[PDB]
Design a protein around this ligand. Structure first.
Ligand code: FUL
Ligand code: CL
Ligand code: CL
Ligand code: CL
Ligand code: CL
Ligand code: CL
Ligand code: CL
Length: 193
């Protein structure tokens, strides 16, 4: 059908965090995961649409930290909300972007934000150019929020939040399609020298 768009998750992997080699300074970023992308977070309708994605984080917000991702193309630091993994001492920060690399990494630092097009954060009538899918890039860094013991620690799989699909086509907008944004759990290692 014209509006038969379907959601798919976008996921990033804890297992790509390098060994954390250690400072008693909190908060601090202790490494970046490998960024991921999904071109087809929303896909399937037969009629092209102007679309945008609104991201809402749903983990507890501990506080803020200034950071500049080594990945992405931002040249200055921004404020990021630190979200709780649930594991003591460990939080994460999030950036998201449109699928295509020219679009900017958008720091997640408010209760909800448009990740693409970023213009929609100040223009409520702005959408992506018409096409048959909506995708995104996902970036995550781990944050030490307190003292970390030496050795391995397990991070559970966490749902970081969801993307809501919006459109200027009412029938599509009204479906309120949502896609999960996931942190795949895994093992990290701390080496305290
Ligand atoms: C062609 C489509 O362009 C859109 O802007 C993107 O959101 C989709 O991922 C897809 O690449
Ligand atoms: Cl994915
Ligand atoms: Cl990966
Ligand atoms: Cl893809
Ligand atoms: Cl950044
Ligand atoms: Cl969760
Ligand atoms: Cl309409």
């Amino acid at each position: 059908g014209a509006n038969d768009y379907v959601p798919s998750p976008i996921t990033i992997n804890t297992s790509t965090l390098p060994v954390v080699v250690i400072a008693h300074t909190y908060p601090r970023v202790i490494g970046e995961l490998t960024g991921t992308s999904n071109q087809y977070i929303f896909n399937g309708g037969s009629l092209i649409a102007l679309m945008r994605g609104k991201f809402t984080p749903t983990l507890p917000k501990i506080g803020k930290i200034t950071y500049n991702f080594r990945q992405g193309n931002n040249t200055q630091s921004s404020d990021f909300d630190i979200f709780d993994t649930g594991v003591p001492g460990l939080g994460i920060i999030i950036g998201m972007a449109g699928y295509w690399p020219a679009t900017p990494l958008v720091p997640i630092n408010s209760s909800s934000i448009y990740i693409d097009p970023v213009a929609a954060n100040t223009n409520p009538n702005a959408y992506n150019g018409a096409t048959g899918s909506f995708g995104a890039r996902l970036y995550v860094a781990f944050v030490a929020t307190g003292r970390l013991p030496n050795g391995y620690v397990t991070i559970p799989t966490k749902q970081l939040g969801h993307i809501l699909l919006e459109s200027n086509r009412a029938s599509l907008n009204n479906k309120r399609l949502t896609a999960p944004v996931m942190l795949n759990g895994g093992r990290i290692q701390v080496q305290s020298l």
